[PDB]
Design a protein around this ligand. Structure first.
Ligand SMILES: *[C@@H]1O[C@H](CO)[C@@H](O[C@@H]2O[C@H](CO)[C@@H](O[C@@H]3O[C@H](CO)[C@@H](O)[C@H](O)[C@@H]3O)[C@H](O)[C@H]2NC(C)=O)[C@H](O[C@@H]2O[C@@H](C)[C@@H](O)[C@@H](O)[C@@H]2O)[C@H]1NC(C)=O
Ligand SMILES: *[C@@H]1O[C@H](CO)[C@@H](O[C@@H]2O[C@H](CO)[C@@H](O[C@@H]3O[C@H](CO)[C@@H](O)[C@H](O)[C@@H]3O)[C@H](O)[C@H]2NC(C)=O)[C@H](O[C@@H]2O[C@@H](C)[C@@H](O)[C@@H](O)[C@@H]2O)[C@H]1NC(C)=O
Ligand SMILES: CO[C@@H]1O[C@H](CO)[C@@H](O[C@@H]2O[C@H](CO)[C@H](O)[C@H](O)[C@H]2O[C@@H]2O[C@@H](C)[C@@H](O)[C@@H](O)[C@@H]2O)[C@H](O[C@@H]2O[C@@H](C)[C@@H](O)[C@@H](O)[C@@H]2O)[C@H]1NC(C)=O
Ligand SMILES: CO[C@@H]1O[C@H](CO)[C@@H](O[C@@H]2O[C@H](CO)[C@H](O)[C@H](O)[C@H]2O[C@@H]2O[C@@H](C)[C@@H](O)[C@@H](O)[C@@H]2O)[C@H](O[C@@H]2O[C@@H](C)[C@@H](O)[C@@H](O)[C@@H]2O)[C@H]1NC(C)=O
Ligand SMILES: [Ca+2]
Ligand SMILES: [Ca+2]
Ligand SMILES: [Mn+2]
Ligand SMILES: [Mn+2]
Lengths: 243, 243
């Protein structure tokens, strides 16, 4: 089976064993109704300096030497819970090699190591980040933003994420699509009674990632913040690539 | 007010006068719960050779000489009702000049005139078409498809639309986004318990359309088919363009 198709309308079925459908790494944990990305104390309050990842267990086929490549679409709703404003550091949906694991916390969103974070030759990861903290030292724009990261914590493209949304603690729905023919990654973020955010960028996944990858969520803190993934849908197709 | 933001969860409030919020042209008509794109007889059966358009009444700002450009996102659910398979001709979401009107029926989707349909210099329209009929004479690929049209009925890009969906008569939800910074148009089509379709293409709207446009739906038939738009949401932002 070359493609994948799954939908989790909610996560109220929290009894599944770690690693069967979803794998949790670091401080990410499964709680009733959600995948909690970082650690919280007894009362459910955000702990500082924490990193965690929740990823699909089965490897995901992206491409192969025969020209076949997967176009995909993933949607998920999440609640980035904030305690005051601003908070740090955010979350990210990512695609990394099958054997990768959680990295540094804080501004690296558990996706990179401090030492190699700004070096594209030492990283193999593509991620759509929802950044809540301005790291002047890593080139973040002067406001919360949504960014597309290709092998580095320094986004190849970003777009303003308003303070009222970034620190509003309302449920948001994200749609991320990748067209394997035009090599276009598009991110759409919506708030029920608010605005929409759009960020598209040309990025050829075949040139930067291995043939099979693991997909998931990664978060890193930071302070006064915790992310919960409430639902998740993923679909891939080989359409338009000879097969 | 430079940007626009509206949401129609449904169209059960059908008493609004033609031209106030939505303008209907040709055979497009407002019926309880939907915008009907083409003509049907007494029983609600599809009539042949019909064209109609349902468009937002207020002009929509796209760009201006000062560098400011609008990124946008539109979503809508529609029921393309089919009587047998195949059917013809499809529907399209489009952006055309403010003073344009409905054109030829059939494969032109009410967006072009037979005489100038394949000449980019004689048309000013960008449309995302959901094509149900293979017009060998206008370069349609050999199957139903979703295409991006820039000033011509001959799509600059397309993607397979499976027969079971194209002629299934199930409600579909479409999301179309345009990033004014990267000049990327992305189309996402989803079926509740089925698959998703993705088609992105680089197209600079500023180079092909006027500063203000009219947005809407256009359909052309054809036979054994009628399209109903069940909901519609549109949002535009000037984010990232100096203002
Ligand atoms: C869910 O299941 C995964 C494995 O499929 C758990 O992650 C794995 O945890 C192992 C340790 O518990 C890691 O290996 C150890 O490496 C050290 C050396 O660095 C050795 O001393 C030790 O003998 C093990 O070999 C293993 O690398 C790790 N897998 C990955 C891909 O990172 C996971 O555990 C959770 O995440 C890991 C990263 C740690 O943070 C754990 O503390 C944490 O529990 C399992 N998740 C849960 C919630 O149980
Ligand atoms: C909703 O309101 C619009 C106008 O804002 C209607 O469309 C307009 O209809 C006029 C005729 O009814 C068109 O003008 C006529 O042009 C001919 C010459 O070609 C003249 O003989 C005549 O005197 C008028 O000037 C006008 O061009 C048209 N507007 C546009 C932008 O096309 C609309 O009518 C519906 O659509 C038009 C295109 C026709 O198909 C009508 O039959 C049809 O009713 C109104 N819609 C409804 C449902 O009432
Ligand atoms: C003062 O010493 C430590 O300085 C660090 C840099 O200012 C600081 O880390 C940053 O903290 C902010 C929140 O205030 C963001 O999380 C930001 O992403 C952090 O920077 C990242 O992580 C640090 C460790 C470093 O690798 C940077 O290159 C990277 O951009 C430390 O704060 C602590 O650690 C961070 C990760 C976070 O958990 C904080 O809440 C925590 O206080 C500073 N250490 C202190 C103040 O004790
Ligand atoms: C045989 O004479 C007429 O030939 C036309 C071309 O085959 C045909 O139009 C096509 O009809 C199919 C459906 O069978 C599609 O709608 C297709 O898009 C039509 O072609 C378009 O429209 C025609 C008029 C022309 O401009 C083409 O360049 C263009 O691609 C005619 O069919 C009639 O008209 C069309 C529009 C549609 O309403 C049909 O249902 C209708 O029968 C042919 N006329 C006939 C058979 O009487
Ligand atoms: Ca940051
Ligand atoms: Ca056609
Ligand atoms: Mn950032
Ligand atoms: Mn076509």
């Amino acid at each position: 089976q070359n493609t994948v198709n799954f939908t989790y309308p909610d996560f109220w079925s929290y009894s599944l064993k770690n690693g069967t459908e979803i794998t949790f790494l670091g401080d990410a944990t499964r709680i009733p109704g959600a995948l909690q990305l970082t650690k919280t104390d007894a009362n459910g309050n955000p702990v500082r300096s924490s990193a965690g990842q929740a990823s699909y267990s089965e490897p995901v086929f992206l491409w192969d030497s025969t020209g076949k490549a997967a176009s995909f679409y993933t949607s998920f709703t999440f609640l980035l819970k904030n305690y005051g404003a601003p908070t740090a550091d955010g979350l990210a949906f990512f695609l990394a090699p099958v054997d990768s694991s959680v990295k540094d916390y804080g501004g690296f969103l558990g996706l990179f190591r401090h030492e190699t974070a700004a070096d594209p030759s030492k990283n193999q990861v593509v991620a759509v980040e929802f950044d809540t903290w301005i790291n002047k030292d890593w080139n973040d724009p002067p406001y919360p933003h949504i960014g597309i990261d290709v092998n580095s914590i320094v986004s190849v493209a970003t777009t303003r994420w308003e303070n009222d949304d970034a620190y509003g603690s309302s449920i948001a729905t994200a749609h991320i699509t990748y067209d394997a023919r035009s090599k276009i990654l598009t991110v759409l973020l919506s708030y029920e009674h608010g605005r929409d955010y759009i960020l598209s960028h040309v990025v050829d996944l075949a040139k930067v990632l291995p043939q099979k990858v693991r997909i998931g969520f990664s978060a890193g803190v930071g302070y006064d913040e915790v992310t919960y993934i409430l639902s998740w849908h993923f679909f891939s197709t080989l359409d338009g690539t000879n097969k």
